[PDB]
Amino acid sequence: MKNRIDPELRAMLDMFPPLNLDDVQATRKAMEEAAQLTELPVDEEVVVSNRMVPGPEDNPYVRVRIYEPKEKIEKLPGLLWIHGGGYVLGAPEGDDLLCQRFVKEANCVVVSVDYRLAPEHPYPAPLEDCYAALQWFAKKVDELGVDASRIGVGGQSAGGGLTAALALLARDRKGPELCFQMPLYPMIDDKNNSPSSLEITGNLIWNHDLNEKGWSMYLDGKNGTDDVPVHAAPARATDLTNLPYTYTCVGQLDPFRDETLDYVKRLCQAGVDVEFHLYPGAYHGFETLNPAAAVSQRALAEYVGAVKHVLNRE
Amino acid sequence: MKNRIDPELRAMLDMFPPLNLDDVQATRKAMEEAAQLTELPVDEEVVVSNRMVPGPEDNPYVRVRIYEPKEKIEKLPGLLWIHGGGYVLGAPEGDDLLCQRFVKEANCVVVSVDYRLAPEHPYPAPLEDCYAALQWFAKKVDELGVDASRIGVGGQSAGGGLTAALALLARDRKGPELCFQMPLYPMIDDKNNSPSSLEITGNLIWNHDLNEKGWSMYLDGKNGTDDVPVHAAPARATDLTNLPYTYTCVGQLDPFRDETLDYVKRLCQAGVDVEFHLYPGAYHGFETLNPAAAVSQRALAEYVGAVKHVLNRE
Ligand SMILES: [Mg+2]
């Protein structure tokens, strides 16, 4: 698709080998080796810690990674953050730069979830870990210096899917209150049969074949069948009423373009307040892979600004 | 729920006397008298001129209003601008401030069409006047100091519908080349039956009842029937292939929300480059009516920036 891709995004596609989910163990080991080569500096304005918190009943405690301002004088809003990786890869540490940016620009506390991964822990384990982390965050607002009426949830890709699912689950459980959801370019349609999901086939970071493998591992082979609940695949939701204010965005060359457009359309029809941005010439994860690109800098500034505006509004 | 309107947009909406299209002749006479009580915006960096250009067979001359930089030392891109007004109101002069902004920020020549209005001149008259203006603009690029490979078209509301229609018509006629289309919150679906159209019924600048009247006058009572060509109502297009790079945006509380989302989706599926922004809490024409509002300033800067980016790239 070379001619369709923004020129500032092309060079990074050649710079890294196409992702492979035929060997998930090997892919995770490779990503962890990459992570060790690229360690962030300490940012002196943001204090980062890990904590073990009670998990879902009869399940392991959940690790969360907490980012807070070095100086707290007044009560702050909160953001639950959920990393991506197809439901099968990833760790909170991968998103330290962005979480530190949300703390500094939104003046908030971020709690990032180390959810269990598929295929070892399929649905509902990853979502229940996110829900346990949200319960802990709401319960500990005293100690964190947070306002429980100003907690939102956000994430990218599979983490965006878990964000949209968690907003539905917390609504349905009269669960902790959420003031905002930011399901960025979210993996929400297990059927993998939208035109955009079918069209994106090659080395464009995420594609139809990767999506098929991630959904198969998350849903233990029930992907695409009638035996998939709304909380596993939010595209299946028919009742989107009484969900939180939503910000999302997607690149037009992301396989998730069409499911994202459809979710936005249905949220608006359900009376949910939505801001949505479709970016031209842009593939999945463009803004994380190409930080120097003008379109990446516009996209990052806008969704950091959404967190700042919505979590702090009167 | 008026609580869903952005607080910065509320005060102008209560001062807005609700539009009445039961007597279009009386409404135009009123708007022209209002215009005469206020001097038109001038700008020392922009030179404004009026020209009569050959029209369709129907209307041998069409007036265009031309905005250019005071200092032209190189070849510039061009923007054909199409004002809004429901197909039944308006004149180029109403958009002088925004056309001057495109000249100054995009460093372009703007040609704004004084198209014939419905119901006196129903479809196809308004679109054929725009097409005649585009033919003249392409023909006179050497005289205007414009690059024929860098001409776009843009407009708002009914002008956005004419923009989308003119991109289809120029494609179909192998008509002058367009490098960009900017059909902002465009009036493109004559059926007036989308969920967003039925949702927006009150005093929110444009609504279901006004939309029915504008379409009935533009299409001489054939609105909603099988007797409506794609060039009269671009929502009817099934072939969106080979259309120019598109920017569009819409407020969530605009009746055009759903038809705008659906056209964006179909453009992307046809392989057209598209940027789209949905703004929360925002009604039709918010950014023109509320220049002080933060969401207005973001929206205006983004679509002025799209003109600048797309007309000057490569
Ligand atoms: Mg299948």
TrEMBL record, chains A, B:
Record-linked Pfam families: Abhydrolase_3
Lyase keyword on record: no
Enzyme Commission numbers on file: 3.1.1.3
Class in the EC hierarchy, top level: hydrolase
Molecular functions (GO terms): triacylglycerol lipase activity
Keywords noted in UniProt: Hydrolase
Alphabetical list of InterPro entries matching this protein: AB_hydrolase_3 (IPR013094), AB_hydrolase_fold (IPR029058), GDXG_lipolytic_enzyme (IPR050300)
Domain of life of the organism encoding this protein: Bacteria
PANTHER family: AB HYDROLASE SUPERFAMILY PROTEIN C4A8.06C (PTHR48081), ALPHA_BETA HYDROLASE FOLD-3 DOMAIN-CONTAINING PROTEIN-RELATED (PTHR48081:SF8)
Protein name: Lipase
Organism listed in the record: Sutcliffiella cohnii
